[PDB]
């Protein structure tokens, strides 16, 4: 893949910062978007060349829209009609995109990437990668979607985020559906709730039932290690049966699957893209 | 360090899968080690481990502690058997709260019950060692463990303790509670909260892969790296940082609100009779 000229809107803030970075380093040319006074003083002080007005959107084969889910629908709203047919507008989350507010346009590409995060029980050795829990440092594989455009925009879209990501191990290729499904489906209704039931519990133990509460995370903290490698093939399992049945009838709801439900997930889109 | 004396420790299974390991730990410590096993292939693990096997019944008379290193299942027949047997002030010692909080110990007023149970390493650590890195039980990496004085002497707690810190080392902290406390903790908070969340997971990632056609490794190594971030975030190993607000929406779909019966100690107690049998 060619280096293509890569417009980050947001690409001083939060969200920005660090992918801008990645980018600025790679073959691609960056065209460094950013209107707040704190985000433009971080890309100068990355030695990134500011923009003003809009000379760069005639220069843009691809535009990354490194904002929050609230307003990706006004800010698409504003940039999509403005940018050259062929031009690919990558976000990074499913929701817009599934929740169906992203502008009608044919002639323009929409890719849709995201980062799995780097993954537990890992062999990183550097220090700096072995607390990075979100990626950038270290390994991690990501997700991506050609939501509409040519077929030979997926390769592109993809280097675009394996760049922006790096080092990026795998790069799954799935459909937007699916994309939401993982994004806010599998992480933020399903793995989400049950993450703070855990921390819920393990205060339960504490107010309740006079628990050290460094004891009860402490078991809490060393049970996950041993459980989610045990589940997940990372170590041999060892009345379990009869046992499970007992606590998911009274831990989890037996319709627990519709948090992965296209419908529900559309719902759940269509509330993060407000 | 404690200020705990050698013991006589006798240890009961011990050259099953679960005794084997800590009965090496005490082979190699201060302590004196009577290891019990009748089973041929426990003996001659045990044997291949260069652990001299204690045979007869002399050994009862010598025991400063009794370790029951058997499966739950089974507790109740094997302490019916030894506990009328010990001398009195004998430490007998359980690796599990559920037989004792089952009530299915027998009723033996002049003898010391101590429960021990491991934390297990923890999820995020500082081990470099490969084979701690890849130790999920204990006995390599470090780790916290949870014990109780059910019955006896107060001058026994540290026993018990110094017991299981030798059988579970390297360990970080021992954190003393009482016996219905461990119970709340295991089964309650292990096997009652966090085993059916942990196997919701899994099966959500099958989910995926069955209904909806994923491939099996991107649902893999997108929930494998979404628990670590979540886990890390949650648990205050990273900053906590749309996502949030959705929260209620989907503890609805998924958790139960009832969810903390899991921790009442009636249904603890419950749990604890269906593994004790």
Known sequence: ?????????????????????????????????EIAPEGRDRLQGMGIPLTDGDGWIDEADVVVLALPDNIIEKVAEDIVPRVRPGTIVLILDAAAPYAGVMPERADITYFIGHPCHPPLFNDETDPAARTDYHGG??????VCALMQGPEEHYAIGADICETM????TRTHRVTTEQLAILEPGLSEMVAMPFVETMVHAVDECADRYGIDRQAALDFMIGHLNVEIAMWF??????????LMEFAKDIVVKEDWREALNPAKVKQAAELIAG
Request: glycine share 12%.
């Open 165 to 168: 990501w790096s080092p990026v």
């Open 233 to 242: 093939g990372y170590s041999p399992k060892v009345a379990a049966l009869r």
């Open 137 to 142: 440092i270290a390994k991690q594989a990501i």
């Open 1 to 33: 893949v060619g280096p293509k000229t890569v417009a980050i809107l947001g690409a001083g803030g939060k969200m920005g910062a660090r992918i801008t970075r990645k980018i600025h380093d790679s073959a691609h040319h960056l065209a460094a978007i």
